[PDB]
């Protein structure tokens, strides 16, 4: 449920940051390429977070923008790749370099990074390439926002794209598109 | 344990809202019909929430008033219907339209919505109609507040209504009714 | 981990209170006898809490003082008695009345309350009477504080009382007693 | 995820402290040797914490500095030793005394403390002595910070020390060391 923290950077111990919100000091685990961009200790930072809930522990993974978080969330969906590994992948290379290596199927650039291997590198590339097709954008709009909303409700991507086509009126909010699209389907 | 959030709306990405409380950014999942009523980003919002705790994740579902939340809480009690489905039901129609479709047994209005079907639509109507009888009101008072309190303590609805009858004195707080009713039963 | 809430009472719906701390609205479940003593909506309240963590849900039980909470914590240790039942026991009678009924073995006063029975009433009395012997006090001091600390560390009650006797110097902090007692045992 | 609390000390009940952050009262369990150093009730305290998450409960263990917390975290990794026992070990002796007793293999100093025994005392000493070798320091630097970061990413300690040697340039940030070391390995 915790999507964003805004507070004072108390300490940096890569890959860990300690952000103070109120008087609560959150431990945020961040990939090294996001780590370089952090403000200075004593200054306010805004980090986008991904809460991983376990039975044994509760952890916050933090990123500087939503595109990096989505990438990380996409990455941990593939069997064999978890938060620590995803943290290492985005430490060894930026999000843009990772997407570029996925698109050009560079399965030699990723094999060096610890904990994955050769077959999982290959499976990661195949799988991520497939996931990027339907993924957001600007690294990988009202009408697109509206399809996403509909997919979130339970419609299948293609059928949601169908619904947001019939009433798709350029220069119109994503919400009215969702309202209009849902109205003419029930 | 989290029943209400009051903070600044940071971002809207239907059905998700990001509300900032202190410097903590909560991700709230809201049905589309509540979503339309939200203030503008940068303005304060008050949302009634339902915390769902899992072993893998922790989520907040948010509504603009308590009646919608109760409806949602009632809805997720029926096997086959979970938070995502309940979110879709209250996206496709308002709470009032849903109660009206339940009372008039319109099992054609709900069949269109994704993820449920025909038999579950039918079971939903039967089950919700039965639950509404004893449900709060104004969509579906000191004396009624007092019966509820007693049901919460473990008394059965009918016996709790019995207790709040013998001493039921119009123009008197629900608490004194609970105090008086509990006193003359022990 | 949440032991106390101090905030604004937003709504009362016995046995539920909604306390706002920051802009976070906590749902606190309180026994009716504590409920009567709450300030008025819009005014600040201080409630002592007991966090019950489950896999399905996370709940706060609240009391006006530490003695009531201890009683509640003691109560839920007995098989057959859980938070809802303990909530009902402290709703039907005050903490003082409950301790008095336990000491005088009144197993007719408790049998009326819903959800327990006759054998569990009897077992509750036997068990609570045994637990009160070693329990805190004022309803059921530096030297006593110090024994408690030592019991918490893992010493057995009798041996901890032994340790805080040899160096027990009236008119001296519980901490120095713990320091002195631990020093002369290792 | 909670690494630090900064708030007002409300009550002390060794080994428990109640720290108020906002209007939220956190129960922090602290070893007695850290307990002696706490400010006075009504004054601000800064405690370093270790959140233990269970299915039944959620607890905060607190320390005055990071070295004590690391020790505690190291301690609870050994089978037979849990938070309560670790709390007792750091109550009976300071962190420095404990490290000294580990280095000099004093397995008579620890045998007195309740809940452990003789074989676990012996195993604790062997195991802690082995863990201290690679452990931080000042009780047990940019280049060392950088190796730690790399170990956290998944590299093995020796190979991470190899990487931070080839480009190890005295008088240079730990982050650039991590950036430079990661660059010349992929």
Cα–Cα distance measured from residue A81 to residue A116, given in angstroms and rounded to the nearest whole number: 8
Residue B152 to chain A, least CA–CA distance (Å): 28
Cα–Cα distance measured from residue C118 to residue C131, given in angstroms and rounded to the nearest whole number: 20
Q: Which of A23, A39, A34, A58 is nearest to A48 (CA)?
A: A34
DSSP D111: S
Q: Contact, D85 vs D116, CB < 8 A?
A: yes
Longest Cα–Cα distance of chain A, Å, equals 54
Alpha carbon separation from A158 to A162, B91, D129 (Å, rounded): 6, 19, 60
Cα–Cα distance measured from residue A167 to residue A164, given in angstroms and rounded to the nearest whole number: 6
Cα–Cα distance measured from residue B116 to residue C123, given in angstroms and rounded to the nearest whole number: 48
Q: Which of D123, B35, D150, B39 is nearest to A177 (CA)?
A: B35
Residue A100 annotated as part of some ligand binding site? no
Optimal mutation site among D148, D153, D179, D183, interface A, most CBs of chain A within 10 A: D153
Cα–Cα distance measured from residue D51 to residue D58, given in angstroms and rounded to the nearest whole number: 7
Alpha carbon separation from D113 to D70, D84, D117 (Å, rounded): 21, 12, 8
User: Which of 2.60.120.10, 2.40.50.140, 2.115.10.20, 3.40.720.10 is the CATH number of A1-66?
Assistant: 2.40.50.140
With H, G, I as helix, E, B as strand and everything else as coil, classify residue B60.
strand
Residues of C in contact with B174 (CB under 8 A): 14
Q: Over the range A128-143, which residues count as b (16 or more CB within 10 Å of their CB) and which as e?
A: beebbeeebeebbebb
Q: Which of D57, D58, D92 sits opposite C186 (nearest CB)?
A: D92
User: Who contacts A171 (Cβ-Cβ below 8 Å, separation ≥6)?
Assistant: none
Residue C74 is inside which H or E element, if any?
Answer: helix C66-75
Tokens of D74: 């190291």
User: Who contacts C15 (Cβ-Cβ below 8 Å, separation ≥6)?
Assistant: B149, B152, B153, C29, C30, C31, C32, C35, C87, C91
Q: Which of D94, D87, D81, D165 is nearest to D131 (CA)?
A: D81
CB contact D184 to A (< 8 Å): no
Chains in contact with B, counting 3 or more C-beta pairs less than 8 Å apart as contact: A, C
Q: Which chain A residue is nearest to residue D144, measuring alpha carbons?
A: A13
Alpha carbon separation from A177 to A141, B40, B113, D44 (Å, rounded): 11, 18, 17, 52
Residue A118 annotated as part of some ligand binding site? no
Cα–Cα distance measured from residue D13 to residue D18, given in angstroms and rounded to the nearest whole number: 8
Q: How many CB pairs under 8 A join A and D?
A: 84
Give the CB-side neighbour count of residue B137, counting CA atoms within 13 A.
6
CB contact A57 to D (< 8 Å): yes
Alpha carbon separation from A62 to A95, A106, C148, D71 (Å, rounded): 14, 26, 42, 26
Give the CB-side neighbour count of residue B81, counting CA atoms within 13 A.
27
CB contact D65 to A (< 8 Å): no
Domains A67-141 and A142-185 equal at CATH topology level? no
With H, G, I as helix, E, B as strand and everything else as coil, classify residue C58.
strand
Distance of CA B160 to the CA centre of its chain: 22
Q: Contact, B131 vs B156, CB < 8 A?
A: no
Q: Contact, A115 vs A84, CB < 8 A?
A: yes
Cα–Cα distance measured from residue C147 to residue C182, given in angstroms and rounded to the nearest whole number: 11
Residue C157 annotated as part of some ligand binding site? no
Listed by start position, the domains of chain D span 1-66, 67-141, 142-185
**Beta strand D44-53 with C16-21: parallel, antiparallel or unpaired?**
unpaired
Cα–Cα distance measured from residue A176 to residue A174, given in angstroms and rounded to the nearest whole number: 6
Q: Which of C23, C54, C85 sits opposite B5 (nearest CB)?
A: C23
Cα–Cα distance measured from residue C150 to residue C177, given in angstroms and rounded to the nearest whole number: 10
For residue D45, the cross-strand partners are D7
Q: Contact, C157 vs D40, CB < 8 A?
A: no
Q: Which residue has the tokens 């981990």?
A: C1
Cα–Cα distance measured from residue C50 to residue C67, given in angstroms and rounded to the nearest whole number: 12
CATH architecture of B67-141: Orthogonal Bundle (1.10)
Q: Which of B154, B174, B182 sits opposite C115 (nearest CB)?
A: B154
Longest Cα–Cα distance of chain C, Å, equals 54
Helices marked H in B32-118: 32-35, 66-75, 83-92, 95-103
Cα–Cα distance measured from residue B78 to residue B133, given in angstroms and rounded to the nearest whole number: 16
How many C-beta neighbours within 10 Å does residue D166 have? 10
Cα–Cα distance measured from residue D104 to residue C6, given in angstroms and rounded to the nearest whole number: 49
- What's the CATH fold of domain B142-185? Helicase, Ruva Protein; domain 3 (1.10.8)
Alpha carbon separation from C17 to B160, C11, C46, C84 (Å, rounded): 21, 6, 12, 15
Q: Over the range B148-169, which residues count as b (16 or more CB within 10 Å of their CB) and which as e?
A: bbbbbbbbeeeebbebbeebbe
Residue B100 annotated as part of some ligand binding site? no
Q: Contact, B154 vs B172, CB < 8 A?
A: no
Helices marked H in B6-156: 32-35, 66-75, 83-92, 95-103, 119-133, 142-153
Report resolution in angstroms: 2.5
Q: Write out the E strands in chain C.
A: 2-13, 16-21, 24-29, 44-53, 58-63
With H, G, I as helix, E, B as strand and everything else as coil, classify residue D57.
coil
Distance of CA C89 to the CA centre of its chain: 13
Optimal mutation site among B8, B61, B62, B91, interface A, most CBs of chain A within 10 A: B91
Cα–Cα distance measured from residue B130 to residue B137, given in angstroms and rounded to the nearest whole number: 14
Tokens of A79: 């069997």
Cα–Cα distance measured from residue B146 to residue B62, given in angstroms and rounded to the nearest whole number: 27
Q: Which of A3, A153, A186 sits opposite B109 (nearest CB)?
A: A186
Q: Contact, D17 vs C4, CB < 8 A?
A: no
For residue B157, the cross-strand partners are none
Cα–Cα distance measured from residue A95 to residue A97, given in angstroms and rounded to the nearest whole number: 6
With H, G, I as helix, E, B as strand and everything else as coil, classify residue D23.
coil
Q: Which of B22, B26, B35 sits opposite A22 (nearest CB)?
A: B22
Residue A65 annotated as part of some ligand binding site? no
Q: Is the peptide bond before D17 cis (omega within 30 degrees of 0)?
A: no
Q: How many residues does chain B have?
A: 186
Residue B90 annotated as part of some ligand binding site? no
DSSP B12: E
Alpha carbon separation from B166 to A130, B39, B159, B161, B175 (Å, rounded): 68, 47, 11, 9, 15
User: Who contacts B179 (Cβ-Cβ below 8 Å, separation ≥6)?
Assistant: C32, C36
For residue D19, the cross-strand partners are D9, D26
CB contact C77 to D (< 8 Å): no
Alpha carbon separation from B151 to A136, B147, C60, D115 (Å, rounded): 48, 6, 19, 45
Optimal mutation site among A4, A8, A22, interface B, most CBs of chain B within 10 A: A4
Q: How many residues does chain C have?
A: 186
DSSP B68: H
Residue C175 to chain B, least CA–CA distance (Å): 35
Exposed/middle/buried for D84, CB within 10 Å: 0-12, 13-18, 19+? Answer: middle
Residues of C in contact with D114 (CB under 8 A): 153-155
Residue D166 annotated as part of some ligand binding site? no
Cα–Cα distance measured from residue D15 to residue C152, given in angstroms and rounded to the nearest whole number: 7
Q: Which chain C residue is nearest to residue B8, measuring alpha carbons?
A: C23
Quick one: chain D helix, strand, coil %, rounded to 5?
Answer: 45, 20, 35
With H, G, I as helix, E, B as strand and everything else as coil, classify residue C29.
strand
* DSSP per position, A57-118: -EEEEEESSHHHHHHHHHHTTSTT--HHHHHHHHHHS-HHHHHHHHHTT--SSSSSSTTT-S
Residue A83 annotated as part of some ligand binding site? yes
Chains in contact with A, counting 3 or more C-beta pairs less than 8 Å apart as contact: B, D
Q: Do D175 and A14 touch (CB under 8 A)?
A: yes
Exposed/middle/buried for D90, CB within 10 Å: 0-12, 13-18, 19+? Answer: buried
Residues of C in contact with B51 (CB under 8 A): 57-58
């Amino acid at each position: 449920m915790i999507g964003r923290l805004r507070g004072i950077i108390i300490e940096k111990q890569p890959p860990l940051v300690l952000i103070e919100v109120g008087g609560v000091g959150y431990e945020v685990h961040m990939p090294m390429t996001c780590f370089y961009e952090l403000p200075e200790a004593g200054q306010e930072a805004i980090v986008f977070t991904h809460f991983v809930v376990r039975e044994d522990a509760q952890l916050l993974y933090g990123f500087n923008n939503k595109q990096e978080r989505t990438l990380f969330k996409e990455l941990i969906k593939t069997n064999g790749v978890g938060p620590k590994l995803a943290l290492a992948i985005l430490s060894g290379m930026s999000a843009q370099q990772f997407v570029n290596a996925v698109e050009r199927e560079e399965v030699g650039a990723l094999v060096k990074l610890p904990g994955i291997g050769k077959k999982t590198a290959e499976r990661l590339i195949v799988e991520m390439k497939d996931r990027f097709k339907g993924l957001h954008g600007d690294l990988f709009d009202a009408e697109q926002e509206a399809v996403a909303a509909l997919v979130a409700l339970g419609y299948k991507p293609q059928e949601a794209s169908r619904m947001v086509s019939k009433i798709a009126r350029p220069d119109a909010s994503s919400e009215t598109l969702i309202r209009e699209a849902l109205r003419a389907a029930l």
